[PDB]
Design a protein around this nucleic acid. Structure first.
Lengths: 282, 282, 282, 282
DNA sequence: GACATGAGTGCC
DNA sequence: GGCACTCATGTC
DNA sequence: GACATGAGTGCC
DNA sequence: GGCACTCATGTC
């Protein structure tokens, strides 16, 4: 139905693949030709379906009737999720070799910063697939079901998780401390304290984010990257990253990662996805 | 040449008129058959042109070239400014009598919460046309002029205004105390402490805004109404409002306005644009 | 055994009566010729007996053996509770007629500021007799009993009240907010945030007490008067004072008392103990 | 004149030797048989003279005419300075061997925590002798001179030092962050943020102190020790202490010192004044 | 991974 | 020796 | 209009 | 009494 453009190349298999691995049961659905999920904008609700058209560099978005009144916001959320704004020539041009193997690489964003915040936290310490298992359990218990599409369930809203029993969340498969962080975040989201759009000063906003309980430097960075689509942040504390930089302290990796400014976020993604990458033999 | 839907009726004449009076020179151009303004998103800049099509109950939005990369967010911005989500059959079905005369009334949004924040402050105490000309100067001294449409100019950014010298601002025609108010608001916007989208607890978010320097209840209320497009706020402290409720105190006015929950914002716009309106014997 | 002298005239009859009305059963014992109570100074505990000998305008202080290692501190405390430093000539000289009927008048201090802090809070709203009873129940439940004096009991320490159960204090016959106030005051004392000795800037100091939950202007002022024995404070908010200045509001009363500076604390006492008094309608 | 008791043994030779090296000209005089200094208790000023009487196991205190109205408070100040409360049999029971060589060791206190805070600061990173002359310059440049005893000047009040030029101080012979410290400390005192008497929670109170500009863990510790006469603190960050524990780290010292709870303050003194002392190699 | 403890650098 | 910046530990 | 004092009013 | 909320009043 609705259509948005993008500049080539765009590696849709990598992107769908990436989203598929972290997908949450009942919320999202990923296949090789499309992406689709439940979506709430205020108290408007429905299902969004995105279908890329490689041929014409266009992404077709479809909205169930419930979302129509806020169609444009729905489109905006989709474009931030798929990084339709990226100009590969600028990025791949600046990263040289690091990006030559997958010039179609994009930054997987989110559809709602609060959700991404809940997602980032649950992803602490555990595996990617394990966090999806956990997020699925949290959603199942606190998310609203779509009347028009019982198969789908909306990601738990800020007000619901805000009014949730720490013990209940703990019971889902996380420490008390973790669940306390989720509830805290929900309140910031209610009060309008959790930036939902990227702030002008990402570094400062991340420092503030770090005062939040349960949110350390890793979480604030990952969240800035996915939740704000901040394009210049590296994850020197990441698990996989520590392995791509065999025997290197976080500050070292961060110093090294500086050669990729102002697109560190993209360099990070290329490293995560370059099987045998290794720092320059210099 | 993008396009969005709206539900009838829609009083464009009224809307364009409201924006027309407040149009800030070089930034926005308002006419009978279209609206157009400079628009910044991150660092993509261009000019937006909105042309209503009463025939097809549709709104045609056209973006220049420096905005196409982020088209979707631009579209979301116009849909918030023009209240496209509004179901008039629902609001009037609730307001009843009060809104029967101008059923096509809509809530004039904003394209960015920071800007709206600046306009709110720069509109304290002074007349409308005044605030416009003043605001136009600020945009003149801090605006990012377009290299594709030099005629137009972007609205100041939080950082371009957070690094502004008060005196220089005051010199434009405003007390110091207020010039400071901007600078502050600018910082808050920089570190993501100024909700850019409507928060869950609109009352709370307003209380927090009231701590800010130069921001009082009237400013917060008005900011929520236009900056967040909050639908259920009334402005009992407003100049014109006090006259519409002769002799009543803020609390009385507020007590009365409770008869229009949850659309007090629409109630307010109808009462505002109804010379000679008066409260009942209730 | 120990002796401390004073300046004639000293109205012991009045001093003992005042303290008599507010005596806390099991903590203090007030007779017509002597005063005595439990006393703790760190881990040093015992009983204190003060016998005033008018003949030789001297005060005789006896100390149980448990307090002997800290005799001086016990002595300084008795001297703060009995205002032995007062120079009746100077005060009565700067007060004139107001302090004619009872020139032996002294400012009733305290033996511990945290205690006086608890008294001030419990003294809120209820009558002197109720405060006394109320305070008595708190003592009975949290106080330390003296092994050599089973009839006596030490006033509750911050360590105990800080750990108290809000509901337990409530059960003693006090609003929850009052018990929470007590628990917060105790935590401050433990932390060192409660000025236990008069600060150089009483105004700043009180304004800082008023941020404490449960403590308002009245309590702060009254705490300063008794707990710091500050000599220049009035209680324009006092009940009995409001009746001594019919029709006048706090500020009016406060503008009137400026005449008596810098001994407003004394003035306050006299106007308090002269049922007839009434201002000089300017 | 006045007499205070003390339990034997009491090493007066040492105590006076301690205070004598740190004596501040014009403020205090120290001799083989007595100690004396200016003293301000509110608006009362004078000279205090302390003369130990080994025969009677007693301390004789003499007050100049201006301190009589607040004699007991003066006596209490002297008791905290000379640690008359100490029961050497208890402290030496615990300490065991460590203090076997000087069973009469006492904790040199202070007569005012503020002064002690100032002293603690001015004595940072310098020599005992230097701090004395440095402090004296400050005393002179901002003190109160006694009319009845011209060669004596009362230590600077919080007010005076609060309103001191942050350069006139650097002048006397100290850095800038050095005069910042004093000036901050002084304001703290004016308002009541600096505990003037030992807090129920020493650790917590010290933490807060460490937030003070210029006040680090060493200062906070030493301040607890002398300004509050806390008896169970230790100074692992002290220069000389490190040498007494060759090599060892500030947490291993702490770990080893734990064996002297709850009299670490005494243990500290013995270790300081026992040169060839070295920990158990065990 | 978040968070408090501890260390050792290293500069005014 | 106050004070900002890291790393290395060790439960949760 | 924001913002201090500053009283009143109504519940804890 | 504490305290949040409410209605002047005066200033910039």
């Amino acid at each position: 139905m609705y259509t948005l453009n993008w500049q080539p190349p765009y590696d849709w298999s990598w992107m769908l693949g990436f989203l598929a691995a972290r997908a949450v049961s009942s919320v999202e659905t990923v296949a090789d030709s499309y992406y689709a999920r439940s979506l709430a904008v205020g108290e408007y609700r429905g299902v969004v379906t995105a279908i890329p058209d490689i041929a014409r560099h266009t992404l077709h978005i479809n909205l169930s009737a419930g979302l129509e009144p806020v169609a444009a916001e729905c489109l905006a959320k989709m474009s931030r999720l798929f990084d339709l704004q990226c100009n590969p020539q600028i990025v791949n041009g600046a990263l040289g070799r690091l990006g030559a193997a997958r010039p179609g690489l994009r930054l997987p964003g989110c559809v709602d910063a609060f959700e991404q915040g809940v997602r980032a936290i649950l992803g602490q310490l555990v595996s990617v697939a394990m966090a999806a298992k956990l997020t699925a359990r949290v959603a199942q218990l606190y998310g609203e079901r779509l009347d028009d599409f019982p198969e789908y369930i909306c990601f738990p809203t800020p007000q619901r998780l805000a009014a949730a029993d720490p013990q209940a969340l703990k019971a889902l498969g996380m420490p008390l401390k973790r669940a306390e962080a989720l509830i805290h975040l929900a309140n910031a989201a209610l009060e309008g304290t959790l930036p939902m759009t990227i702030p002008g000063d990402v570094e400062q906003a991340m420092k503030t984010l770090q005062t939040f309980p349960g949110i350390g430097r890793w979480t604030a960075n990952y969240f800035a990257l996915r939740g704000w689509q901040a394009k210049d942040v590296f994850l020197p504390d990441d698990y996989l990253i520590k392995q791509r930089f065999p025997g290197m302290t976080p500050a070292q990796i961060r110093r090294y990662a500086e050669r990729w400014k102002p697109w560190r976020s993209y360099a990070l993604l290329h490293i995560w996805y370059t099987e045998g990458w290794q720092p320059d033999e210099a």
